[PDB]
Design goal:
Oligomer: part of a larger assembly
Organism (chain B): Caulobacter vibrioides (strain ATCC 19089 / CIP 103742 / CB 15)
Helix content of chain A: 55-70%
Shape of chain A: elongated
Largest sheet of chain A: none
Protein name (chain B): Flagellin FljM
Function (chain B): Flagellin is the subunit protein which polymerizes to form the filaments of bacterial flagella.
Distance between the termini of chain A: 58 Å
Subunit structure (chain B): In C.crescentus, the flagellar filament is composed of multiple flagellins of 29 kDa; 27 kDa and 25 kDa.
Largest interface: A-B, 10 and 12 residues
Family (chain B): Belongs to the bacterial flagellin family.
């Protein structure tokens, strides 16, 4: 703490901002492709079921 | 997250607390000037006995 | 008292300053997280209830 080298608080703030960015990316992907499950990466089982259907 | 934690641990291990160093710097500068003046007063000791001859 | 070796007042001021910096860190956490109970360290009980719910 109170040092000119490490800055752990910026690291925690960056982790939080990256989580918010991942959430916004997933939501814009839903908005763009129109599906809550657009690929096997989203959820493999229901995706394969929808493909066979 | 693990790399961030390891960097925070290195910083906890070796970083210094600069705010304490500021007060230490001020006090040691004053102490050094006081020690130089004390050494000069110690150097002046031999002058007195020339007057008594 | 009145010495070149120690300075208790800077120690006490540093303690109060570290307390203020810790409060700033917790405020930045609640700001970038959006939650007043973002982890088990903040409070285990309501956080555990929120996870299960």
């Amino acid at each position: 703490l109170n040092s000119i080298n490490t800055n752990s608080g910026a690291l925690i703030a960056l982790q939080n901002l990256n989580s918010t960015n991942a959430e916004l990316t997933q939501v814009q992907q839903r908005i763009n492709t129109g599906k809550k499950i657009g690929s096997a990466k989203d959820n493999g089982a229901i995706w394969a079921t929808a493909k066979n259907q | 997250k693990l790399q961030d934690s390891l960097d925070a641990g290195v910083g906890n291990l070796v970083d210094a607390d600069l705010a304490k160093e500021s007060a230490k710097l001020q006090s040691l500068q004053t102490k050094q000037q006081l020690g130089v003046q004390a050494l000069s007063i110690a150097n002046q000791s031999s002058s007195s006995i020339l007057s008594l001859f």
